[PDB]
Structure 1
């Protein structure tokens, strides 16, 4: 299946000679606890329509998270735009410590032991983009062992 959570909704405007027109832009993070997660944005005159459009957008750009032993294999840093998110492994039973959007994306991804810090701006969309970007350069022991032509025991 696919579970979704709403992050934020913002009312944006645009000026015309007859006044102004407003509409809502909604950010939605979808994912399942198997290790798949994604984010999306929607825009509509009504909030539920924006949520539905954001969900449909998020369903099209899913990614995967390596979650060996329910923990990030190694620390990484995202760098998208003006946001910075640092993710590092945590011990078993430590829970998840993160900011709002980062907590949402990590919880929907499926990880249970990870600690993160925000080192940049606090704009939610840039925070989510930075978190996903940091998730990009994750690694698995088997994959790097195959890349370097050796076994896991030799590498670890």
Structure 2
């Protein structure tokens, strides 16, 4: 796993005596083989917050299908105010994506994808929306078995 921090936010709760601050850190974790996950953790110091997120993240792994170093088809993720469409790109074109949507595509091990975030730009929701799109994504052999066909017949 090759964790990459995304945002470190400094939140505060006001108490009768004043304000008590905290740090929330968003971390994306994955290996380049095709598994990726994200997690969040709140603490009182930045190094403490990061450790919690990495521990949390390692329990939410998801799998990405990556035919020919690319995603199979185009999907649109959707979580709350965040929306992100992913579209396959031609070989050697690199990863064309924003801030926190690029982190989950480089960690996942994908090489050639283009995308565009059409909704809000909150980092917490741009990672949920991307992972939601990863769910709707499906390979040819997986579809062929479901429909009782053969991969040759489909294509």
What TM bracket, shorter-length normalisation? over 0.9
Partner SS, residue 130 of structure 1 = helix
* TM-score, normalised by the number of residues in structure 2: 0.99
Partner SS, residue 149 of structure 2 = coil
Match of 1:110 in 2: 109
Equivalents in 1 of 2:108, 2:99: separation in Å? 14
* TM-score, normalised by the number of residues in structure 1: 0.99
Partner SS, residue 53 of structure 2 = helix
Give the RMSD, CA atoms, in angstroms: 0.4
Tell me how far 1:150 sits from its aligned partner: 1.0
Equivalents in 2 of 1:102, 1:16: separation in Å? 36
Tell me how far 1:38 sits from its aligned partner: 0.2
CA deviation profile, 1:45-103 (whole Å, cap 9, x unmatched): 00001000000010000000000100010000001110000000000000000001011
Equivalents in 1 of 2:17, 2:24: separation in Å? 22
- Following TM superposition, where does structure 1 have runs of at least 4 consecutive aligned residues deviating by more than 6 angstroms? none
Aligned residues: 155
**Unaligned 5+ runs, structure 2:** none
